[PDB]
Design a protein around this ligand. Sequence first.
Ligand SMILES: [Mg+2]
Ligand SMILES: [Mg+2]
Ligand SMILES: [Mg+2]
Length: 431
Amino acid sequence: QQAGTETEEYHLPLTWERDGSSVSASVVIDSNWRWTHSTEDTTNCYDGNEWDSTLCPDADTCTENCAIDGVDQGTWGDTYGITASGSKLTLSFVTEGEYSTDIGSRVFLMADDDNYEIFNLLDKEFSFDVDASNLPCGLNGALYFVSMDEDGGTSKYSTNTAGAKYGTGYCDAQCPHDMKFIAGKANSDGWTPSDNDQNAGTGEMGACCHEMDIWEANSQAQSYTAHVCSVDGYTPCTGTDCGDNGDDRYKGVCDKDGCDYAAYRLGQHDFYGEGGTVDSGSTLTVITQFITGGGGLNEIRRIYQQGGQTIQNAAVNFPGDVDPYDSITEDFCVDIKRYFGDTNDFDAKGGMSGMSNALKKGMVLVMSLWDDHYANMLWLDATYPVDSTEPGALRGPCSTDSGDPADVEANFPGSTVTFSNIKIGPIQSYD
Ligand SMILES: [Mg+2]
Ligand SMILES: [Mg+2]
Ligand SMILES: [Mg+2]
């Protein structure tokens, strides 16, 4: 995409800490949350959930004709409900303006005005504080990493002149087709509007890359998950390579399910939630350690702190069925997927070694707040598939009727997540 000039671009300042030093950085809104309009005037190229077929008769003409515009200082709060102060960042769920309503947001941490910050997580400990207390069943306040290009694609894709400055180039291990710009081009060929998301659709291309989810959570359930792909960084896909939901789920280049460590799913129901061992009703500190052996990732450990207490991760609780792992390791992924009858696409795509090489190449930090128009977040917090009664179905305490976006947007529009005190440094010992 090219950049429009109706609105100035301002990245919202945010401080974090890198190896003991304060870093005055900023965040940028993902291009998919922006206005896409004609280069000639204010006509929308992307209008509701379909592209204008005069402006966008094919993807090449659409990319020539259409621009993504800026988010200025006032737009962060008034349009997206996003605020920051010091090292604290708050995302909102439903923000109503006079003329449009925003649902959630996704942002990336910047190194400077034109480049995302690149994190090399191997043999490091990454931590942050989160308040998930204002996230009901069906919402997900997420902090994660993805193998995006540092410049958002400007150097590789000549028709992307907007770049990381305008939050371009998102990809993840779902190979999402809902991205409006992929490989510097409008994804308007073969566009189908969503039947239940009035803002979203899907195009022929998907945007694939490795993904390390540090935190997917609401007040009721939480997981961390490693997703590896068999391709090198940001990779546009079409057709079977995208591994689309359904019959092709395990046939594409990325592991959509990932190797997940979800304490409630692993038989530890009282560990995290309202009044849990880790209490979701107040701020908590999430510590993640990327442990190496011979320079390669072999374990992803989790420690929590809250109220000055150090809380070790809850171990797998299936006595007689699965060993009491308490971290993501190769053996955990193999044994738990055998137990849950899940296809081990994590190993098929390269397993812990492939994941180690992804991390070695560097990843971009993402924070987002969203609801789920595909599966109502039931995979995170309820039972999924909804009528399944075998090991691995039960994910959290929420009803299988919870999380419909129409319901949560109507009933909990004031939901928010606050992330703070983002930190990277050497691996520490905890007791
Ligand atoms: Mg043409
Ligand atoms: Mg850097
Ligand atoms: Mg074609």
